[PDB]
């Protein structure tokens, strides 16, 4: 075969991985991985081009990102602007892409029966894209919103600020997103033909030698091979040299520098950065991760422990951070308490003290050995990935590793390299340090402005006196290396499937205190389990004050277990613990071996909790800011939030919570906890590598612990009250209007309430949503370009449902309203004009999506958990609902549109949330809308309306 340059030897995989693999290099240089999974419901492909933003023309920032957007909008073989989206949508698929500095990564999934058609359309992106003039003029606005959305976001600002403070000559300094100015206005002004620059760029850099492809399907490896050779060997090889960046963006003049930065949110952070060489080639020893593991440790003896005890920091991140081919960074990032903010010099001294400890002890093979063993176990028992993410991830790493090692390369450690460890450790020195402090206290004291985001900051030399103090850091006896991790699992035995084992969770305990749902894993056979618990107390959400206290309690509890639980975390045993409107939620996930130990500790801790006053005051202060910082969330997020407040029976606002927070004292909190625990109901799902007897024991152990230490008594069934959704009146339209003070975009959510969830009402809604899904995106974004964010689909809450539209835009909400209304009328015509085959395609597409099997335990657990917390308990829901779905007709959907959704629908139930921005033809005809009732007060609104029933259990 002349189209294939070489075929891969065995691709190393986990012995638990039933998927089949073959690696190839095509004659044109494309590295390929083929994955055969005859069980998969969705097939997938991805292609990664080893070119990105760092290669943008200096005079056209964002070109490669723009290019990425434009490949979706038509090729020579498939010139219809949305043929790709529409094909994927009509075949249960989805696509996306991303542009980073050195990569452009495209990926899709689709129903397994339609891989070839999806893959063919896809391949044309890399052969002959149209870069249509009309589409270019429109899509540039979507890139502009993407950017607009990021501008007042603290992370993006910091991201670009770093680039702005290094060598300006370095490609690292480039603005990667682009916007209307960089991609249209300035280029027109400078006489540039952007369509030619896209063609020029595609031609020069989209070369086969820089591409890697991954394809996953039901087909055999042989069949997948022919397929890929067929569609991809015509991609042209231009032998483009791979861009490299051997010169660090941070040279001498950029070291021993301090940056004082004003955030948008009220946050307090410190970023310590060291420039380091490119460690990528050392992947078999991974010295930077060895050091990140230690410097970032959260257990006893760690840097974070001492910083916490001193009341200076709460969280810490440490380790290596990617740059590009040629350079990397090493970082230590902490948040700051109000004291911490006054002690940055000391915090940083402690950092250099801990680093000095590492020099003193030298490289530790036992530490390396441990990281190795953990990674080995993690790889062996890796959860089976969803195809779309998997092809994308592997396509990226086909560029860095031999074909035979792509699956293992990022997991298995091979080499102990004390030499490389000392080499990197030698870079972590004060003379090589960069320091950034983010705090509102710098407000008004800054003299520089980063140009792309507007970030206010100040730059100073770190004084030599301060550098010297850091350089002479003695050994602090508070810092000890971590000890052996006792949570490392050793028992991976898969218990044989019991005789009375069930396909769905079975109710195996139904007492006044406990409802225990159980299922032994019959699918995945990895030594793991998920243990989920809902704790109900009417006292977790009875008022704002108690809602605050439930939160602080659990935050305090997690803060207190952190040192102990960290070992468990590294050993693949994690837990999740948060307060809810009904109670408390606890999830323990991971290797089942040491699980009961961690679970017992959490419950013991809950029931015998002693609060540290210093920890209390600090966490309370952070929570204060956290509530306040909601003002800086995105407009569309505000819209969703306000709607959730409006449609739920009981809901405390951020203002209400914040106001009540000043009244939370230590005495009150101490009194609250035993009250909260005094009466409970526990509903649990125990699912995985466990038996009925172990499950009964785990459950009973949780109860017995609560009973012994907290004297927990049962709740009454009548107390187990779920909240209802507000029942909107026939033909009603309500508008609630608010302003976002931070962002200069508007947000809108439109909710067309339909009826109670129900087999029939569920599938009417879901099928209509399926049909309008792609056209809504194509119409409201691609054509009309209202915003980057355009979403439509079902909304489900409290047993009720309806259709929702969410948009974030530069246009005012009342304008968005008419365009969404104009769009609905178009869909009605579209359903009338659509063929029977086209209609059945949509039924078939939704069917595939609903019946898509979970590939890992947690995904299956999640399905059940939904059935359980919604109190609907409909475990066979998918087969049932798909069967009903298949009997539906074009006529049925049209009747449902006319009765519930159309503008003059007799049972239209419409509520709109308008979030105004900070400073506030060729188009289809929008219908005239009625005068809306403007909601002035959320409480009056709820009082004046009925409440829906709750859904009856299955």
Rounded distance between C-alpha atoms, residue 274 and residue 428, angstroms:
6
Q: Closest separation between CB of residue 808 and Zn ion, Å?
A: 14
C-alpha 333/C-alpha 351 separation (Å) is 10
CB 605, CB 557: distance < 8 Å: yes
- Chain position whose Cβ is nearest to Zn ion: 146
Q: Which is nearer to Zn ion, 146 or 593 (CB)?
A: 146
Q: For the CB of residue 65, give the shortest distance to Zn ion in the complex, in Å.
A: 6
Distance CA 687, CA 284 (A): 36
Closest CB 389 distance from Zn ion, rounded Å: 18
CB of 73 to Zn ion, least distance (A): 13
Shortest CB 178 distance to Zn ion, Å: 9
- Give 750-793 as a 3 state SS string: EEEEEEECCHHHHHHHHHHHHHHHHHHHHHHHHHCCCCCEEEEE
Which of 184, 555 has the CB closer to Zn ion? Answer: 184
In the complex, least distance from residue 165 CB atom to Zn ion, rounded to whole angstroms: 25
Query: Which CB, 101 or 363, lies closer to Zn ion?
Result: 101
Nearest CB to Zn ion, comparing residues 148 and 219: 148
Residue 146 vs 683, nearer CB to Zn ion: 146
Nearest to 492 by CA among 589, 597, 378: 378
CA-to-CA dists, residue 61 to 160, 177, 187, 894, angstroms: 13, 7, 10, 47
How many Cβ atoms are within 10 Å of 534's Cβ, its own excluded? 21
Q: Tokens 């010099």 sit at which residue?
A: 345
- The β-bridge partners of 709 are none
Residue owning tokens 């950029």: 254
- Enter the tokens of residue 196: 């030619």
Q: What does residue 493 show for φ and ψ, rounded to 5 degrees?
A: -65, 130
Min separation Cβ 495 and Zn ion, Å: 47
Residue with tokens 């970082």: 331
Q: How far is the CB of 105 from Zn ion (least distance, A)?
A: 12
Distance CA 269, CA 331 (A): 13
- Residue 883 Cα distances to 607, 671, 847, 851, 877, angstroms: 47, 53, 9, 11, 10
* Between 71 and 279, CB nearer to Zn ion: 71
Catalog residues that contact Zn ion under the rule CB under 5 A. Answer: 146
Closest distance of CB 53 from Zn ion, Å? 11
Alpha-carbon separation of residue 375 from 463, 738, 860 (angstroms): 42, 49, 25
Give least dist CB 103 to Zn ion, A: 14
> What phi, psi does 794 have (nearest 5°)?
-65, 150
In angstroms, give the least distance from the CB of 64 to Zn ion.
11
**Shorter beta-carbon distance to Zn ion: residue 66 or 379:** 66
Beta carbons of 367 and 417 less than 8 angstroms apart: no
What's the CA gap between 143 and 67, in Å, rounded? Answer: 11
Tokens of 388: 């779309």
Looking at the Cβ atoms of 146 and 154, the one nearer to Zn ion is 146
Q: Which is nearer to Zn ion, 48 or 146 (CB)?
A: 146
Nearer to Zn ion, 68 or 225 (CB): 68
Gaps in the chain (C to N distance exceeding 2.5 A) after: 920
Residues 6+ apart with CB under 8 A from 452: 160, 164, 175
Residue 262 C-beta: closest distance to Zn ion, Å: 27
């Amino acid at each position: 075969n002349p189209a294939i340059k070489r075929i891969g030897n065995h691709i190393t995989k986990s012995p638990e991985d039933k998927r089949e693999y073959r690696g190839l290099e095509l004659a044109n240089g494309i590295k390929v991985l083929l994955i055969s999974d005859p069980t998969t419901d969705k097939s997938s492909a991805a292609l990664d081009v080893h070119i990105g933003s760092l290669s943008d023309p200096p005079n056209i920032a964002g070109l490669s990102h723009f290019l990425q957007h434009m490949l979706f909008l038509g090729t020579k073989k498939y010139p219809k602007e949305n043929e790709y989206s529409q094909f994927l949508s009509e075949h249960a698929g989805s696509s996306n892409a991303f542009t980073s500095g050195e990569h452009t990564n495209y990926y899709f999934d689709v129903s397994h029966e339609h891989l070839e058609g999806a893959l063919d359309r896809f391949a044309q992106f890399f052969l002959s894209p149209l870069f249509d003039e009309s589409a270019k003029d429109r899509e540039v606005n979507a890139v502009d919103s993407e950017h607009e959305k990021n501008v007042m976001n603290d992370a993006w600002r910091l991201f670009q600020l770093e680039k702005a403070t290094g060598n300006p000559k370095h490609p690292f300094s480039k603005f990667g997103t682009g916007n209307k100015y960089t991609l249209e206005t300035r280029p027109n002004q400078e006489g540039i033909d952007v369509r030619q620059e896209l063609l020029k760029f595609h031609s020069a850099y989209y070369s086969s030698n820089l591409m890697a492809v991954v394809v996953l399907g039901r087909e055999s490896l042989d069949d997948l091979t022919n397929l890929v050779v067929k569609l991809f060997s015509e991609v042209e090889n231009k032998n483009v040299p791979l861009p490299e960046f051997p010169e660090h963006p941070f040279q001498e003049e950029h070291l021993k520098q301090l940056y004082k930065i004003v955030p948008i949110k009220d946050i307090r952070n410190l970023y310590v950065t060291f420039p380091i060489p490119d460690l990528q080639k050392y992947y078999k020893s991974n010295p930077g991760h060895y050091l990140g593991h230690l410097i970032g440790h959260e257990g006893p003896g760690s840097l974070l422990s001492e910083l916490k005890s001193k009341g200076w920091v709460n969280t810490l991140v440490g380790g290596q951070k990617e740059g590009a081919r040629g350079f990397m960074f090493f970082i230590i990032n902490v948040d700051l308490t109000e004291e911490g903010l006054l002690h940055v010099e000391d915090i940083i001294l402690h950092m250099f003290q801990y680093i000095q400890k590492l020099r003193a002890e030298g490289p530790q093979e036992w530490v390396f050995q441990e990281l190795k063993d953990l990674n080995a176990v993690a790889f062996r028992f890796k959860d089976k990935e969803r195809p779309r993410g998997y092809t994308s991830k592997i396509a990226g790493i086909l560029h860095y590793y031999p074909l035979e090692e792509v699956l293992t390369a990022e997991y298995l450690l091979e080499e102990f390299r004390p030499d490389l460890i000392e080499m990197v450790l030698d870079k972590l020195r004060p003379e090589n340090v960069r320091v950034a402090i983010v705090s509102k206290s710098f407000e008004g004291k800054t003299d520089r402005t980063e140009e792309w985001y507007g970030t206010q900051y100040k730059q100073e030399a770190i004084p030599d006196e301060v550098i010297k103090k850091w350089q002479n850091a003695d050994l602090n006896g508070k810092f000890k290396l971590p000890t052996k991790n006792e949570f490392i699992p050793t028992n991976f035995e898969i218990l044989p499937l019991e005789k009375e084992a069930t396909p769905y969770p079975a109710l195996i305990k139904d007492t006044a205190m406990s409802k225990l749902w159980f299922k032994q894993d019959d699918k995945f056979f990895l030594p793991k389990a998920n243990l989920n618990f809902e704790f109900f107390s009417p006292f977790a959400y009875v008022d704002p004050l108690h809602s605050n206290m439930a939160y602080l309690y659990l935050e305090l509890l997690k803060d207190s277990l952190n040192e102990y639980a960290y070992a468990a975390e590294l050993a693949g045993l994690s837990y999740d613990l948060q307060n809810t409107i009904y109670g408390m939620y606890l999830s323990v996930k991971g290797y089942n071996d040491k699980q009961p130990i961690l679970l017992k500790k959490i419950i013991e801790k809950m029931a015998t909790f002693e609060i540290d006053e210093k920890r209390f005051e600090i966490i309370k202060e952070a929570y204060m800011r956290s509530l306040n910082n909601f003002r800086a969330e995105q407009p569309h997020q505000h819209a969703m939030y306000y709607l959730r407040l409006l449609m739920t029976e009981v809901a405390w606002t951020k203002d209400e919570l914040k106001e009540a927070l000043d009244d939370v004292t230590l005495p009150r909190l101490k009194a609250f906890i035993p009250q909260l625990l005094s009466r409970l109901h526990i509903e649990a799902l125990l699912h995985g590598n466990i038996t009925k007897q172990a499950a009964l024991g785990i459950m009973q152990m949780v109860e017995d612990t609560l009973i012994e230490h907290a004297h927990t008594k049962p709740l009454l069934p009548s107390q187990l009250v779920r909240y209802r959704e507000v029942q909107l009146p026939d033909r009603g339209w309500f508008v609630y209007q608010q302003r976002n003070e931070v962002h200069n975009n508007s947000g809108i959510e439109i909710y067309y309430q339909t009826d109670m969830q129900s087999t029939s009402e569920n599938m009417f809604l879901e099928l209509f949503a399926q049909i309008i899904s792609e056209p809504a995106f194509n119409t409201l974004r691609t054509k009309e370009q209202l915003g980057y964010i355009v979403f439509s689909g079902p909304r489900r809450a409290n047993g009720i449902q309806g259709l929702r539209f969410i948009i974030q835009s530069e246009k005012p909400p009342h304008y968005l309203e008419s365009r969404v209304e104009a769009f609905l009328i178009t869909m009605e015509k579209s359903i009338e004009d659509m063929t029977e085959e086209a209609f059945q395609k949509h039924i078939q597409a939704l069917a595939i999506r609903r019946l898509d099997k979970p590939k890992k335990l947690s995904a299956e657990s999640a399905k059940y958990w939904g059935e359980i917390i919604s109190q609907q308990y409909n475990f066979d829901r998918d087969n049932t609902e798909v069967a009903y779905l298949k009997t539906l007709t074009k006529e049925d959907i049209i009747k449902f549109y006319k009765e519930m959704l159309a503008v003059d629908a007799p049972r239209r139930h419409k509520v709109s949330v308008h979030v105004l921005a900070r400073e506030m033809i060729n188009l289809s005809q929008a219908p005239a809308l009625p005068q809306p009732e403007v909601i002035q007060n959320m409480t009056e609104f709820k009082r004046g309306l009925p409440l829906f029933p709750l859904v009856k259990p299955h």
